Amino acid sequence: MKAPVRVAVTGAAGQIGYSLLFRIAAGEMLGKDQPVILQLLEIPQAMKALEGVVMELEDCAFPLLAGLEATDDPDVAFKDADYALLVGAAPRKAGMERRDLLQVNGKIFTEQGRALAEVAKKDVKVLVVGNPANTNALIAYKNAPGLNPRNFTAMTRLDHNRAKAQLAKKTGTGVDRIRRMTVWGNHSSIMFPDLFHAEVDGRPALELVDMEWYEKVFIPTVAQRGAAIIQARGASSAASAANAAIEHIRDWALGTPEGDWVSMAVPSQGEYGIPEGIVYSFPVTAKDGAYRVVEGLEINEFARKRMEITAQELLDEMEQVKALGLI
Amino acid sequence: MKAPVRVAVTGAAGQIGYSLLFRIAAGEMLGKDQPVILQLLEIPQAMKALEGVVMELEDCAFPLLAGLEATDDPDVAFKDADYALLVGAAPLQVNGKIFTEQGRALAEVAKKDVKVLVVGNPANTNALIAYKNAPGLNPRNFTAMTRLDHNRAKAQLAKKTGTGVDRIRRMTVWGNHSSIMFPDLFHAEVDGRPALELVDMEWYEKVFIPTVAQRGAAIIQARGASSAASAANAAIEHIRDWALGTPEGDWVSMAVPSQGEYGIPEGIVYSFPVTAKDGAYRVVEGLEINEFARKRMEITAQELLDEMEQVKALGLI
Ligand SMILES: NC(=O)C1=CN([C@@H]2O[C@H](COP(=O)(O)OP(=O)(O)OC[C@H]3O[C@@H](n4cnc5c(N)ncnc54)[C@H](O)[C@@H]3O)[C@@H](O)[C@H]2O)[C@@H](O)CC1
Numbered sequence: 001m002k003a004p005v006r007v008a009v010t011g012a013a014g015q016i017g018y019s020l021l022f023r024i025a026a027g028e029m030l031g032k033d034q035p036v037i038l039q040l041l042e043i044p045q046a047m048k049a050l051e052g053v054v055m056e057l058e059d060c061a062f063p064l065l066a067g068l069e070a071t072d073d074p075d076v077a078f079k080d081a082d083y084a085l086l087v088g089a090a091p092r093k094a095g096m097e098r099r100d101l102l103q104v105n106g107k108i109f110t111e112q113g114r115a116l117a118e119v120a121k122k123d124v125k126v127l128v129v130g131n132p133a134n135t136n137a138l139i140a141y142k143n144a145p146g147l148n149p150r151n152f153t154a155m156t157r158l159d160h161n162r163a164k165a166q167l168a169k170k171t172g173t174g175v176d177r178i179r180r181m182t183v184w185g186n187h188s189s190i191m192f193p194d195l196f197h198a199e200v201d202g203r204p205a206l207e208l209v210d211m212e213w214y215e216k217v218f219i220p221t222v223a224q225r226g227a228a229i230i231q232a233r234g235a236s237s238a239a240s241a242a243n244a245a246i247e248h249i250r251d252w253a254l255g256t257p258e259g260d261w262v263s264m265a266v267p268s269q270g271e272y273g274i275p276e277g278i279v280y281s282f283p284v285t286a287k288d289g290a291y292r293v294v295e296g297l298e299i300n301e302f303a304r305k306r307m308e309i310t311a312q313e314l315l316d317e318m319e320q321v322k323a324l325g326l327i
Numbered sequence: 328m329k330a331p332v333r334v335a336v337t338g339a340a341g342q343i344g345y346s347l348l349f350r351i352a353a354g355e356m357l358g359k360d361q362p363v364i365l366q367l368l369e370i371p372q373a374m375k376a377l378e379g380v381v382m383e384l385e386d387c388a389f390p391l392l393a394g395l396e397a398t399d400d401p402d403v404a405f406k407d408a409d410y411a412l413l414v415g416a417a418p419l420q421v422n423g424k425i426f427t428e429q430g431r432a433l434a435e436v437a438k439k440d441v442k443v444l445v446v447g448n449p450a451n452t453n454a455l456i457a458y459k460n461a462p463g464l465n466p467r468n469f470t471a472m473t474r475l476d477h478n479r480a481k482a483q484l485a486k487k488t489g490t491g492v493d494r495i496r497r498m499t500v501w502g503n504h505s506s507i508m509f510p511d512l513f514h515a516e517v518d519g520r521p522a523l524e525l526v527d528m529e530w531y532e533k534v535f536i537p538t539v540a541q542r543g544a545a546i547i548q549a550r551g552a553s554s555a556a557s558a559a560n561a562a563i564e565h566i567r568d569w570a571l572g573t574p575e576g577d578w579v580s581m582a583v584p585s586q587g588e589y590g591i592p593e594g595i596v597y598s599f600p601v602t603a604k605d606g607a608y609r610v611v612e613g614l615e616i617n618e619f620a621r622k623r624m625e626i627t628a629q630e631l632l633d634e635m636e637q638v639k640a641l642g643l644i
Pocket residue numbers: 010011012013014015016017041042043046087088089090091108128129130131133155156157158159187236238241
């Protein structure tokens with residue numbers, strides 16, 4: 001019954017794409033009743049590897065895969081897209097300093113912002129994964145004249161899921177019984193996973209674990225998790241990041257559970273006093289393609305301190321990119 | 328919900344393992360209401376990497392992942408196992424040690440009705456070593472994978488005839504996962520029509536067979552790495568279709584221990600057309616085997632017989 005939706009994925013021959021594409025075509029992100037057409041974008045150097053990825057997608061014989069196309073032009077990839085996952089971003093290079101990374105990214109994200117505005121569905125839903133995700137989502141929406149800025153989001157779902165995994169281990173309860181986790185700010189060393197509103201089986205998180213543990217054990221371990229993986233595997237956490245990507249999209253399109261919320265970085269409308277315009281991770285509920293920030297939570301001083309630091313870091317990078325005339 | 332099943336997976340820190348585990352834990356293999364306990368086995372030198380994979384699985388916050396354990400001991404990994412996916416193999420003697428030790432561990436500690444899928448190459452021969460060395464377990468519960476070749480062939484047919492992949496049924500790949508496997512278009516249907524009515528015999532033998540056999544190499548030449556995601560997909564489907572069952576009017580390819588079917592030597596692990604229902608499979612017997620098909624069935628049966636022989640020579644079985 002359902003007509004196919006078009007899903008654009010950039011960075012498609014990369015590591016995250018290699019763990020993401022198969023699970024999307026199997027129907028894990030938008031439902032087992034919803035056929036998908038994948039429109040994959042790579043840079044010209046990666047096209048041959050992308051062709052090999054395309055062959056492996058064909059070799060899975062996915063009944064929901066209604067169409068598959070690979071290109072190196074952003075106007076063909078985003079053509080009529082319903083969803084766009086912007087995973088590609090500039091690589092890191094030797095002695096290539098921060099502003100230099102900002103500049104290169106500014107380039108990709110301006111171009112892609114423009115392309116979306118010209119050829120995608122007007123209500124295209126956009127997820128930016130490529131780092132730095134928050135600032136890249138800022139640059140894209142500001143270059144996508146004609147699209148609603150609230151359709152541009154950035155991922156904090158990996159940090160959210162890591163925080164829920166640690167709390168589950170600590171309190172010895174199934175991960176399916178942790179609710180109301182929040183990660184505020186962005187995917188960085190300074191993100192703030194908030195346990196003041198979380199619940200473990202119905203009980204408040206902070207009745208089961210103490211502040212000492214929270215502040216000197218839990219916080220640093222979530223912030224170090226990505227480094228731990230790299231030290232153990234010798235490669236970054238692609239499967240777990242692809243999984244967070246899928247969840248971020250699924251929960252947005254299909255809706256969040258009753259009584260719960262998820263973390264999403266979205267353009268601020270001054271909620272909790274966070275400056276307008278910046279892309280900032282908030283507690284959010286969704287229902288049918290739309291989300292709203294969860295307002296009214298009580299912020300203590302511990303919280304506010306941490307939320308503010310993260311707002312300031314994002315305000316600064318925004319400063320830099322403005323200074324580069326990127327926005 | 329059902330009670331959890333223990334799924335053991337060897338070679339867990341490798342390439343297939345990395346594309347396999349998260350889909351299993353997500354409920355793609357046994358269903359969304361079946362929680363799973365993952366029991367992962369690696370060699371001691373890949374244990375560090377393995378702990379990294381464990382960390383990533385935790386970080387998916389999967390509701391159906393009821394437990395996770397990583398080990399370098401087969402007797403720990405296979406304990407009370409209900410399903411075992413044997414992916415790790417030797418980068419004949421060396422494989423032989425692996426498969427006898429693993430076949431023995433399974434017999435000692437796993438469930439009596441443990442279902443086993445051998446992926447590590449050479450898969451058909453490796454499944455023979457294990458079953459032969461797994462005194463006490465039903466040898467028919469030991470299978471090898473030919474589902475990847477099966478899926479590739481469906482893919483090529485769909486592409487040729489312009490039809491959707493979901494409309495191709497009754498593909499068969501006889502023999503093993505090898506350059507001489509035989510993908511049979513004689514009984515396949517494309518949108519209810521016989522395949523060979525839509526496709527000619529010259530394309531079949533000149534274009535189709537060679538292109539399916541070369542598929543793994545095309546991928547390596549393209550990506551610079553072998554086909555891990557699509558092989559993991561094929562392994563998931565092999566298990567799923569055996570555990571849940573095949574669709575009505577259809578069949579799948581699996582390599583199973585021969586019981587003389589189609590005149591194939593008893594004992595060697597050989598790929599046939601099978602239907603399955605709730606954990607048991609049955610060979611599709613009584614198909615018409617023409618002469619073009621027999622020669623090819625013969626060749627691959629021969630090769631398999633040699634290795635069998637060779638393996639006895641080593642006193643492995
Ligand atoms: N926000 C988050 O929580 C996370 C963000 N992450 C970011 O995820 C991004 C991708 O990570 P991978 O591990 O897959 O990186 P890979 O280097 O494996 O893949 C990146 C891919 O991007 C492609 N690419 C580059 N520029 C492109 C462009 N202009 N158009 C289309 N494709 C282009 C490259 O050709 C490459 O294939 C990185 O920026 C990474 O830092 C990950 O670290 C996951 C966590």
